[PDB]
Write an enzyme that holds these catalytic residues in place. Structure first.
Site, short mmCIF file in Angstrom:
data_model
loop_
_atom_site.label_atom_id
_atom_site.label_comp_id
_atom_site.label_asym_id
_atom_site.label_seq_id
_atom_site.Cartn_x
_atom_site.Cartn_y
_atom_site.Cartn_z
N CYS A 54 -16.38 38.27 -23.33
CA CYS A 54 -16.17 38.97 -24.58
C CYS A 54 -15.19 40.10 -24.26
O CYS A 54 -15.58 41.15 -23.74
CB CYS A 54 -17.52 39.49 -25.15
SG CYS A 54 -17.48 40.46 -26.69
N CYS A 77 -16.08 43.35 -26.49
CA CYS A 77 -17.27 44.21 -26.24
C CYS A 77 -18.20 43.63 -25.16
O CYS A 77 -17.96 43.91 -23.98
CB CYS A 77 -18.03 44.54 -27.52
SG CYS A 77 -18.25 42.98 -28.38
N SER A 78 -19.23 42.86 -25.55
CA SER A 78 -20.21 42.38 -24.53
C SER A 78 -21.01 41.16 -25.02
O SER A 78 -22.12 40.95 -24.50
CB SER A 78 -21.14 43.49 -24.16
OG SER A 78 -21.57 44.19 -25.32
N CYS A 79 -20.47 40.39 -25.95
CA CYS A 79 -21.20 39.21 -26.50
C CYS A 79 -21.62 38.26 -25.38
O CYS A 79 -20.78 37.92 -24.53
CB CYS A 79 -20.44 38.61 -27.63
SG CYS A 79 -19.77 39.95 -28.63
CO LIG Z 1 -19.32 41.52 -27.13
#
Ligand SMILES: [Co+2]
Ligand SMILES: [Co+2]
Lengths: 203, 228, 228, 203
Positions: free
Chosen positions: A107, A110-112
């Site tokens: 991601c 962000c941090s998916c």
């Molecule tokens: Co993310």
């Protein structure tokens, strides 16, 4: 990296702690956060939901070609067969490693991460070093950071989760494991093999 | 927005800092920051897209080096102030108080059954973002498309490294909440969603790996036809 | 490189911090950092382009919030270590020493007449980067050109916000030192230089001002013909 | 902007000071830096080279249309007529404000500025706030940060110094100044009017 402007880690931890407890006391007073809500959420992802769930899907796909076809058609519905699903895995798409193709996941925004099969992600996955460089130099990154040398003739496919579709790697079944049980196979499926930064364990 | 949070293809950010192992939560404060996500979403602080947009508006030096879950705190504060659910000056006084009395008690409060029911329903059942729409899909597997060059000042899922680039639709997933509207307080306005494939040489030029491709998910308005 | 130093079009960086007045030098240390530029260039630490490249490789959180002249110190240290002109461990011991003895004397030394002659000649005469080349210019005023989409990992003058964009050559200035080679230790290899004009709607999409253009200087290899 | 990670300004100033004095002592010992070299460089740009030089070129162009044509043909050669030139102004291109066009200048990549006509730039010109936003929202930036409202029908031309060509704005001659001396006119030419963030002074 060195930043002459940055406080020490201890100074930073003390300041965040006081800021978080301040916000916590305000939400609590406003009726919207409670201490039981905190412990319930933490206890799910410390004890219930984790990479062992995803390992279960991988070994069923290794040992059952009908499930594997259904897992690649619709990862969400297929994982539901094993009672696996939920928050931040509402839409999963699994991708198969072959002799010709290697898949790795990120991601960049962000941090998916597919929480229901993998749990919460490790910090390096959420941090700018991996996120920035994987889409641009996957091969050198897999070598230098993970000791995993992907031959230049082999295609590296990088999957950026810009939407709510969550991508999970189905790693290749290691050689030397004919007839192994699902429990024995499950010992070779790492969190890393389901992100694509490592293969499944050898031997 | 063109924020530095959008780091795909950014050079110079350094080697990866990866311990061999780490706990889910490195300090109690991270558990609190994490549990605030459902608490704050149910109270109407913001949506999932607004959540992302508040992290994206952070001070970027702060964003780049803070502990991850601090990004969540920032977006909580951002939306609390904007909706007036959080008095910033009272937050500051409380922070000082807890700087000096770190073991001071939390305020007394009823436990709420419904907050536990909500946690369990979201976690096991999901909070899906799929939606039905009346229009059919403009695009289909194998269509060649070009990512928009638009640069909205508000929230969007348009990584700088794919703008203007040419790809092949690989999969149509259905319609989903559109972040360009939802993340800016403009509603779900769901759009059809596609995985598009880009060669690394399309993305980076001759510095791209000759045997590598990147798959990036594009909502319909992000792409227009080049070739079927 | 795709460094965050290349901030043209970056959103979210905040309001401008502009006092009504300020001295040329805000502290003695800035005079020192500033004078080191000619001292270090004459000693062969690096070139003007290498100078820029060492600032570009900074920690970006550090780059974004440090006092400006600290960028110069960083690039001095970077090239001193790379050429072995600076022992990093001795630099660290000296820094600690001066942390604790800030008024401690500098080391004793001869004053050098030639360092003053050099300062005066560079400042009043210039250090021009114009060069003669044998090839004629590929492009001319009024030609329509498209900026490269290349993304070199080394030093280059290719702001992310102009890559892939279409402009009109407005002026040919002659040939100059090419940064894509000079800044990477590959020599002057001078190239013809052009000012190209871009509309703001070409650059930003519909979010661009309808009555605004940006002029950006491109070396010949940065652009290829679209229309004469 | 608030950064909970950042030390105080005083802490930062103390640390840079010790680091700069450490580097200074090493260069001095190696023969390549001296204290007279520092004072000579500082004294040039504290006392000799500054915006008053550029003011001289502006008023000659205002009061002499032949010079103005030569200034716009080749800014370096024209400034040499007044003995003005040198480091970081080897290549100057001047651009004329009109009723139809407004020019403003930036180095989005670092801090390029025509030193020989303007001296060293102020810190806001070198800092990320102005650099990032001028090429993207010039009109709103001129309004909000400089109180200078440029009509939407008037073209804003932004000049990014990606090469060694240095760009200088020739501002419009204010009304109400017919027949003024070069010295009287020179009081209306600011540093800001030669960057393009302000017009020349009124009255
Ligand atoms: Co993310
Ligand atoms: Co510059």
């Amino acid at each position: 990296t060195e930043n002459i402007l940055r406080k020490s880690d201890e100074e930073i931890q003390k300041e965040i702690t006081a800021r978080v407890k301040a916000l916590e006391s305000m939400l609590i007073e406003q009726g919207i956060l409670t201490t039981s809500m905190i412990d319930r959420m933490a206890e799910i992802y410390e004890n219930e939901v984790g990479p062992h769930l995803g390992a279960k899907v991988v070994v069923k796909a290794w040992t059952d070609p009908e499930f594997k076809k259904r897992l690649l058609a619709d990862g969400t519905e297929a994982c539901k067969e094993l009672g696996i699903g939920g928050l931040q895995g509402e839409d999963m798409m699994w991708v198969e490693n072959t002799d010709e193709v290697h898949h790795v996941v990120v991601c960049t925004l962000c941090s998916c991460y597919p929480w229901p099969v993998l749990g919460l992600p490790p910090n390096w996955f959420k941090e700018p070093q991996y996120r920035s460089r994987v889409v641009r130099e996957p091969r050198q990154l897999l070598k230098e950071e993970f000791g995993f040398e992907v031959p230049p003739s082999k295609e590296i496919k990088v999957w950026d989760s810009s939407s709510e579709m969550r991508f999970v790697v189905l790693p290749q079944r290691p050689a030397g494991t004919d007839g192994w049980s699902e429990e024995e196979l499950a010992t070779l499926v790492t969190r890393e093999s389901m992100i694509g930064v490592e293969p499944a364990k050898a031997v | 927005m063109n924020g530095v949070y959008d780091v795909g293809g950014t050079d110079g950010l350094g080697p990866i800092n990866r311990p061999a192992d780490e706990p889910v939560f490195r300090a109690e404060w991270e558990k609190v920051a994490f549990a605030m996500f459902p608490a704050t979403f149910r109270a109407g602080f913001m949506g999932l897209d607004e959540f992302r947009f508040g992290i994206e508006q952070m001070n970027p030096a702060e964003y780049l080096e803070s502990p991850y879950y601090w990004h969540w705190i920032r977006t909580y504060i951002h939306h609390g102030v904007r909706t007036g659910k959080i008095d910033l000056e009272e937050l500051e006084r409380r922070t000082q108080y807890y700087r000096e009395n770190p073991d001071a008690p939390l305020p007394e409060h009823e436990q709420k059954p419904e907050l536990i029911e909500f946690v369990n329903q979201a976690v096991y059942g999901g909070l899906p973002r799929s939606r039905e729409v009346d229009r059919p899909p403009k695009f289909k597997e194998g269509d060649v498309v070009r990512f928009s060059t638009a640069s909205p000042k508000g929230h969007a899922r348009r990584a700088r490294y794919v703008r203007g680039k040419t790809g092949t639709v690989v999969k149509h997933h259905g319609a989903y909440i559109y972040p360009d509207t939802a993340g800016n307080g403009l509603g779900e306005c769901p759009e059809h969603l596609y995985t598009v494939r880009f060669t690394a040489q399309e993305l980076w030029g001759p510095e791209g790996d000759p045997n590598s491709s990147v798959y990036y998910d594009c909502w319909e308005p992000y792409i227009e036809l080049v070739d079927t």
